[PDB]
Amino acid sequence: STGSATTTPIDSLDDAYITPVQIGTPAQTLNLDFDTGSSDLWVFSSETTASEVDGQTIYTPSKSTTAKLLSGATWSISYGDGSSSSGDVYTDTVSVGGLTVTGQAVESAKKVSSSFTEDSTIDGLLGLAFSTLNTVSPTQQKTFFDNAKASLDSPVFTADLGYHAPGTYNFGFIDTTAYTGSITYTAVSTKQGFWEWTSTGYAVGSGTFKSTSIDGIADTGTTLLYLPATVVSAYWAQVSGAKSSSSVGGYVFPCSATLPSFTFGVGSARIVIPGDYIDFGPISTGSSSCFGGIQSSAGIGINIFGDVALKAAFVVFNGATTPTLGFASK
């Protein structure tokens, strides 16, 4: 089997991407944030505290003839941005782009933090990291990909995120028309439960390539590119007027400035992030100060190849017995 679904930016800045997901019988379609940095499929629901729901579409398990309470099960998660959610668990039928999993753990939110309430466009998350990170207790649950894997034509999924435009998640096949050149594959460590890999270096604009190992994760659920402070400093030093603002919480720059591209290494191959991808607009309405899309990972404890980086590439998440990551230009 295979599946193919369009993923759409939630706003004009590509702050996140939502993908429609069918849950239950009859189908209840929710728009979920596909997150290769986590491993819980959780949704706004009829069980979510009423005051914490503000415009989201909810899953109502009582209206699904295939929903079954996973008795005794609870879940609770926190994310890198300080947001969180928790609740209980049902199993139900879940379909993405024509690909159907029966008995998928669907984690129903009883509580969500303010960040989630305040974002009306995201109805929940669909985690695509390794199932070892899944927070369901007492019995850890498998991700949608893990459940689908054996049925797929090939045990892979791909992320093809758009810049200020829709893109595609495919399951079970590699669309050879979706990228240019060849796909370069690189080793993955699953030791922290992430799609963790080592970039071979970087360049800023037309500058010479710096060979240096950068360990990080391929994370569709993180908006920006978070790299070591040295790398980030080297980038913004090439932008006139750029500075790191503690009050804002990162690098900002005048929008009159031209942003250089940023290149990262995948083995001997090179992915070029165009400068425009690194512009996240005014820090506040009417401000001449713009927020940068490349920021320091210092104090995150890990480097994150988020959407800014991933949307410059066609990315293969290869879930073979020994997982790997593939990157192509497009």
UniProtKB/Swiss-Prot annotation:
Q: Please report any disulfide bonds recorded for this protein chain, giving both cysteine positions.
A: C255-C290
Segments spanning the bilayer are none
The UniProt gene name for this protein comes to: EAPA
Species annotation: Cryphonectria parasitica
Q: Specify the enzyme's EC class, one word.
A: hydrolase
Keywords noted in UniProt: Aspartyl protease, Disulfide bond, Hydrolase, Protease, Signal, Zymogen
Q: Which residues of the full protein are shown?
A: 90 to 419 of 419
Peptidase A1 domain boundaries: 17-328
Any GO BP annotation: proteolysis
Name of the featured protein:
Endothiapepsin
